[PDB]
Amino acid sequence: SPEALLKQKLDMCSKKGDVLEALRLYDEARRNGVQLSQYHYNVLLYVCSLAEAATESSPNPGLSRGFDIFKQMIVDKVVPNEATFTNGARLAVAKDDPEMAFDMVKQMKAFGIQPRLRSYGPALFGFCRKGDADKAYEVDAHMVESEVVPEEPELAALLKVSMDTKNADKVYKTLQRLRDLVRQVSKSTFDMIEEWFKSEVATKTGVKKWDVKKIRDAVVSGGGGWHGQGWLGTGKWNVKRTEMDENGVCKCCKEKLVCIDINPVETETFAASLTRLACEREVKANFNQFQEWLERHGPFDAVIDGANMGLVNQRSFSFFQLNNTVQRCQQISPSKRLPLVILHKSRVNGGPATYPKNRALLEKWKNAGALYATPPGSNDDWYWLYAAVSCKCLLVTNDEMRDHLFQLLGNSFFPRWKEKHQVRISVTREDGLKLNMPPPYSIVIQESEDGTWHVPMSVEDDLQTSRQWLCAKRSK
Ligand SMILES: [Zn+2]
């Protein structure tokens, strides 16, 4: 079969990295009237990615013709799948022509195809590297229109190009986008923001007088912690690296940060999504049986990730650490409720429970309506997540909650819910175990009603390392 033959020959062409032969085989299929499939086109897009940008001649046929092949696949109305977007982007990156990368995205739109975030990258970053803000903002507007949401790298690039071209309005807007979408910024972005606030353009932007009611109504309207009405005040900024104390008080300026509310409607949307995602991955009857059990149990003040409590910082499962965490949670519960312990059934039956009194205790918790043993093959993460969300209560786990399945939960609501609900344990020699409670303020970029800014750096473990903030306050 000829379609099937071209495949074999393109799969073979190549592990070898032979672009000139893939381009020959491409042309031959069209001379033979063999219609290229999704698969053929993808391999061909990949193979062309391997070509390099001619630093000393007119561009090479591999990259150059790669864009041609891309264009033709779309004309042919061959549907793109995830590999198509990836390879198309590699091709764009390798070529490093932002205008040609932008063309590929325009072509996709013209044929009713939704570009991916990675499709926009080579265009956005290309224009930003070249200092072409006007084109960078075109790409940004295109992405907004296609409903593709930027991540921190795209925002930071937009921030820097706005700084480079002295555009104080676009800096403001991008900082608001960082607040809304990212919350806590990387070391790179943090340093960039610090430069912005100490810069001549920042010193020279602002207003001496403004409508206080306008700001007040914007604060209420935006949900808290910002106003979005523009730079306030005048003159040089005092810009310091600082920390918040445990109550959210800036150690530099003594402003107390805001605790920003989560809208209960968002929480109910998230709970529905969580249940849908869990039932796609669990045996549906197993998850449903837990949902039904939970409906008949509680109330709960806390839910414990039993496997994480037994294992975090241990060389093997510590019933001590789990049990001490149960006791601690019950002690801080105003009415002394036992926490809901989520644990695999395997664990309920043999170390923990190697020792008869530990096994009896596990059964006692179950009998108290405070332990659910998840069935073999289940991922218990869905279970403790769903319980904490549904019971609207604390979640005790030191799981990072960022990798694998946790990426499925998104990067707006879930991180905000996490900060309000997650309790983590720490241990010291002098004191033993401690529960680290949610902060009484929101760890996010905040803009105060008088235009003062507080910007938090993102950190891997804010109990291990002390989180740095930027305090930017007008000097007069
Ligand atoms: Zn401050």
Swiss-Prot record:
It is an enzyme of class 3 (hydrolase). Residues 244-471 form the PRORP domain. Mn(2+) 1 binds at D305, D380. Mn(2+) 2 binds at D381, D399. Binds 2 Mg(2+) or Mg(2+) ions per subunit. Its cofactor is Mg(2+); Mn(2+). Zn(2+) binds at C250, C253, H454, C471. Disruption phenotype: Embryo lethality when homozygous. GO terms for molecular function: metal ion binding; ribonuclease P activity. This is Proteinaceous RNase P 1, chloroplastic/mitochondrial. The gene is PRORP1. The chain holds residues 95 to 570 of 572 of the full protein.
